[PDB]
Design a protein around this nucleic acid. Structure first.
Lengths: 60, 105, 50, 246, 72
RNA sequence: GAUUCACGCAGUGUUAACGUGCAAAUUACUUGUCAUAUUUGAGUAUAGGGGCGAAAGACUCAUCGAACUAUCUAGUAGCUGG
RNA sequence: UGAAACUGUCCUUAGUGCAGAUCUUGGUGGUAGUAGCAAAUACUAAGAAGAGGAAAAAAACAUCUUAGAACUGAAGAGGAGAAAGGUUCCUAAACAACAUUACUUGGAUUAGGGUGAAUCGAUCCUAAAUUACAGAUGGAAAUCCUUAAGAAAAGGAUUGAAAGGGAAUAAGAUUAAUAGUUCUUAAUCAAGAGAAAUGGUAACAUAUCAUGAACUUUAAAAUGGAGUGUGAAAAUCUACGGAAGAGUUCUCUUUUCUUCUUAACAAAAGUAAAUUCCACUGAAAUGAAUCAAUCAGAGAAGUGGAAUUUAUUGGCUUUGUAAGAAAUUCAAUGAAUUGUGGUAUUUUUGCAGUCUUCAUAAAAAUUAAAGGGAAUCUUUUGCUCGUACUAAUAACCGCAACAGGUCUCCAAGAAGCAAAAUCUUUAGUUAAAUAGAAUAACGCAGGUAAGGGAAGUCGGCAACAUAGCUCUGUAAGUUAGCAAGAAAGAGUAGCUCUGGUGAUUAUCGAAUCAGAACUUUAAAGGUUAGGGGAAUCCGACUGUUUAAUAAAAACAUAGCAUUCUGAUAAAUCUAAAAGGUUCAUUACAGAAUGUGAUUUCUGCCCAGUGCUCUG
RNA sequence: UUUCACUCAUUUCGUUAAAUGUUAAAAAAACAUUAAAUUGAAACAGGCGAUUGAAAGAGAUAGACGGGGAGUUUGGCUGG
RNA sequence: AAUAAAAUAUUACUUUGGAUAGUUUAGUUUCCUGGGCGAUGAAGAACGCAAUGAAUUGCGAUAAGUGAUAGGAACAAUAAAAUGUGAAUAUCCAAAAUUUGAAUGCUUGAAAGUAUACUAAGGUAUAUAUGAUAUUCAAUAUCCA
């Protein structure tokens, strides 16, 4: 789950996530919050596991 | 009895907002969206409903097979068989009469 | 309403963001008179008319 | 005072015609060579009910004397027409009911309907239900013919004005007595906003010139000059006579 | 019933936010702004409304570019 | 555009309640009415000597025998008060 | 007391002296601990948390759990939406203020979290209508025109619907809160990528098949309402057979209650109702048929076929999905079951004909077919925006937690003609501007009353009284339709029985009607539920009306009558206008008036004032 | 000045401005197009076709009419 | 006839209130100098940006600030880091300048969008009227082979 700019569509976010973390993305759902930010739910491919990305990013 | 609720955000009993309530596992009843009742085709002359063609929505005819949207006959799908028979006799009898009346009477 | 235009929704969100009090640290500044936000409102008290 | 109801009628806000379900403009087809010097044959596909008017309308279909396709016309039915009938329009058309002929070819005493006051203007006179005009006489010197209008007036038209032979269908419509206020309400479904008519004497002096005092009465003569301004022209206008006719 | 009872059905907006002046004065049916005089090219100003002039005019906003030029 | 009951609606009577009220017009019972001249939502049209009115000078945002708002305007007062 | 400026005399100057102006602004009294904190049936016991039930009864105690007792009564005080609100949603900490006592509660304070769509909507199309360039008009602002005026737009520009049209998604599970949106499983749709067919007599039929351009036509999208009959599904009820659990049980009850289910999309074992057509034949002694109709030599009935519709494929059972889910039990994650029917009621959804209109009850986007003959299964992608919550006796509009107002969907049992009143099940709630004691007057709301019975009063105002169903009976008057439920009289309970009304071919089934013995507290009446008659006036009737003192005899109405106009007109809006309304019209029409159904009848007057004259 | 004849401004109209003018040569609810062989499918006018027409409309000045509308007035004394 | 509970009156102190006195980073008037906006996109509006910000101030995806030139040791409510190899602070300078707005490709309601061309995504140009030049055309409108 990421917070992204409103002016970015689902295609831009999917490509951006792949470029930033070198992973595979299969589905992106976006909701625009009240404050103005766009919350994106990026689901990765089954082979790539999101626990390794979370610790590599630093969420844990 | 189990009472139900509209699933979509339409809240009025409009023609396009028709629903059906069907039973479902656990005794619950769910809501379906039923299609509008449509008319078929009509003969171009006598205005009678043609046989052999289903009464569905206009776009659903493209989904049907090529043979299921017409009748294998001259003017099939636009004119009834009675409509067609009168067309043939008119075309032949009038032409034959023209050969005898005029055109070397 | 459940249905709203995109621009209208953002103007709703700002009104939510502006309905906040003074942070405590700003209240400890020297020569500070701004203790409470007099532009505040609540849904059941004053309708923001938008 | 105020502005009376006849003044508010000329602005057309709620008094606009309720013409949404009407079939269209009912008239002859546009004049051409094939109608001036020949005959074009049309087929009466169907007879339909046009809202707001008492006569049925015929959906005639001429072919296309100059191009490829169909010329879907919309005539006013003459009494006796039927579906599948052939009708011929032109100067050489036979004198049969439903045929369209120039008014000069009709013998004196012919009953016509939907006559053009001017050549090629596609029908003016004798268009209501059961109405007709009679050819009085011809005048080949200046190509004019005399006809008797349904109001009884005599009119002189050019001898090449077109008309349809017969009687407009749906006659005897107004002989059936309306019985209920609701029935009259339904009559103006496809007409203008006029029906529930409040008497001027029941209004107030601001509303109407008739708006009276302690007794419901007019007070001044109800026969007025033609030159009265809009606003006081209420009642009988330029009345040459009054009272019950003998 | 011209008082309390009649105000029950007031749930249909007449004016919405305008785009040129930002006030809730855009008449929906009239398709015009009652305050800043929208699509009309000129800003709506009247000499009888002297106060309405001093509420929105030059110098009541940011003056993002004009402040540099006049100081220049 | 028959007779009635019901969901609803209106407002005949009590000239009941309340009348610094639940309410800047409501409540209770009684009464009437309760689908074709019916009831009703949204959209749309008609603007102040104008609109709209099955007509009461009725309605036109609690404002109507001429709305609201601002300018002329600190309108004038042989009249009242200080 | 106060802690940094000020005073006396002479001239000068003035925004220079207050008790009043219903004076202006601010503050404060008596009234006064007074009037009140009384609609919406209602609370109680034990325990927990808390400073917050103490006590010589200080008789009352907010929140949560359990138990008792209750209300809304399924057209709801239930579960969800449109508008409007805008974070009120969920959780935690915390109770200074606010919810007419209090509150540990809150829609209140503080801080976090929360809205996931190729398939639902917006976006697309057009309706009433709306707005541009050029043109026309105007002193001006600006107005008109919307395809007519144009070197503009094969044909006509912009906008206009979260209820009209519309490509395509469902079941289960999941969160403190989102879910046709997430997860599992299973689907669908659009755009892409890898001399040209047979069968049937015919109606017509063939897992893509089996070529089909320009141009043209037809159809669909896309059409009122009423009433009757009927197909199917669901709910309720019920018949037979059970399996599991629960309740009652010293009085009985082989007993009473709960569960026994299944999606989108497709398949085609079995089998329906209705309508329309095709082939053979040719109907009179006329037949066929419906609740009603309606139909036949331009061809009935009969027999054999074809097609379409019936909430997705093809209507119902059945099948795949799919039992692996879900429900009900059991054991301590693992085990069990998940038949078949009904000539019953309601709802929903179709179908068939009938009736009715001086009413005939939308358009486009978009799709298919035809006439014509020009030319020679796998895979990718599906963008933008809304999505939380209330939707109201507390989230919307009325200054508010206001007995007012505000558009919709789903809808159990009893009883009954009834969606009526009354009671209950599923769900919701016991709080919704404070209570305790005593039981005066005067009240508001609900009642009864001896004998008399409108004598009260402006007036039977208010209240009493009649009230359902069956049978008998029903006048004058009348527009012959009505009056009429006229008026008036009798019957009605419980229990035990008897008979009539069918289906299928002896078995099965329906509430309905009639009748008879016996008993009693002698029977519609708990609730629901017309007082009746004799006349007079006005208005013919159904309808409308002064929002907030007049609902009517007033307005409307149908009917009757009068006037003008041949459309380049009549009426009439505009400052002007290839401007606008009736008029998408054409005298059976348009415009202006009076009277007010029907019956009977509308008398005399043209001087006066109007109107008019073909003078 | 009146009465005529015309159209040429002008008015009112109609269409896809689709054969104008002058020479030349009711039996049948059906189809009709993208031509075979410059013709086929004739030429020209200085008029897209009708209609009205020097009259009518709009302007100026003048007379009449005009509560449809605008502005204003409706003396004083007074056993009220 | 008697009581001083209430009532009344004076003073001191305290309370509710904010008069009076002292004071001014605010106004009013006159005068002097200018009167310097915009298709190179103005005035106005909207949204966003601070380590802890809700308003306000400043600013624009380079964000309470960047470069340059002056300037010389601070800011502070609390931390951090930077800092004489240059902190604050100042500016008619340089770069940069979101969505709109005359708003100008088309649409615009609270509307999300979208067409073509040039240089997938990004960025430019394309409204109406108008002057000059260039180029392509139309009309026998005038001649004319």
């Amino acid at each position: 789950v990421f917070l992204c700019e409103q002016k970015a569509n689902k295609t831009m976010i999917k490509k951006a996530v792949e470029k930033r973390y070198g992973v595979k993305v299969i589905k992106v759902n976006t909701l625009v919050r009240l404050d103005g930010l766009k919350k994106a739910f990026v689901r990765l491919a089954p082979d790539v596991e999101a626990m390794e990305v979370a610790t590599k990013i630093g969420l844990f | 009895a189990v009472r139900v609720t509209y699933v979509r955000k339409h809240s009025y009993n409009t023609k396009s907002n028709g629903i059906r309530i069907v039973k479902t596992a656990g005794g619950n009843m769910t809501v379906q969206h039923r299609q509008k009742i449509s008319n078929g085709v009509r003969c171009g002359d006598c205005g009678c409903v043609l046989a052999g063609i289903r009464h569905i929505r206009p776009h659903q005819y493209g989904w049907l097979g090529k043979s299921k949207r017409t009748v294998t006959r001259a003017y099939g799908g636009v004119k009834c068989h009675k409509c067609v028979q009168k067309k043939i006799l008119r075309a032949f009898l009038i032409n034959e009469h023209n050969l005898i009346k005029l055109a070397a009477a | 309403t459940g249905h709203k235009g995109f621009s209208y929704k953002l103007k709703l969100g700002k009104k939510i963001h502006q309905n906040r009090g003074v942070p405590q640290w700003f209240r400890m500044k020297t020569g500070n008179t701004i203790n409470y936000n007099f532009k505040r409102r609540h849904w059941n008290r004053r309708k923001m008319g938008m | 005072g105020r502005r009376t109801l006849s003044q508010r009628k000329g602005r057309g806000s709620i008094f606009k015609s309720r013409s949404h379900h009407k079939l269209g403009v009912a008239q002859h087809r546009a004049i051409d060579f094939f109608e001036r010097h020949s005959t074009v044959r049309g087929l009466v596909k169907s007879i339909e009910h046009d809202p707001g008017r008492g006569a049925p309308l015929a959906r005639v279909v001429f072919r296309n004397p100059r191009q490829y396709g169909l010329d879907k016309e919309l005539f006013i039915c003459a009494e006796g027409l039927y579906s599948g009938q052939y009708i011929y329009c032109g100067s050489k058309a036979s004198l049969h009911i439903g045929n369209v002929l120039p008014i000069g070819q009709c013998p004196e005493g012919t009953v016509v309907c939907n006559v053009e006051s001017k050549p090629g203007d596609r029908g003016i006179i004798a268009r209501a239900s059961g109405n007709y005009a009679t050819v009085i006489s011809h005048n080949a010197d200046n190509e004019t013919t005399r006809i008797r209008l349904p109001s009884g007036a005599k009119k002189t038209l050019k001898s090449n004005c077109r008309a349809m032979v017969g009687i407009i269908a749906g006659g005897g419509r107004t002989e059936k007595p309306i019985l209920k206020a609701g029935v009259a309400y339904r009559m103006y479904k496809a007409k203008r906003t006029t029906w529930p008519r409040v008497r001027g004497v029941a209004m107030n002096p601001v509303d109407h010139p008739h708006g009276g005092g302690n007794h419901q009465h007019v007070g001044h003569p109800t026969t007025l000059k033609r030159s009265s301004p809009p606003g006081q022209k209420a009642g009988k206008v330029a009345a040459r006579r009054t009272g019950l006719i003998r | 019933t011209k008082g309390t009872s009649c105000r029950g059905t007031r749930h249909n907006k007449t004016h919405i936010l305008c785009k040129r002046c930002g006030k809730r004065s855009w008449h929906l049916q009239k398709q015009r702004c009652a305050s800043c005089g929208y699509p009309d090219a000129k800003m709506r100003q009247y000499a009888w409304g002297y106060k309405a002039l001093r509420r929105r005019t030059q110098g009541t906003g940011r003056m993002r570019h004009l402040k540099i030029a006049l100081k220049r």
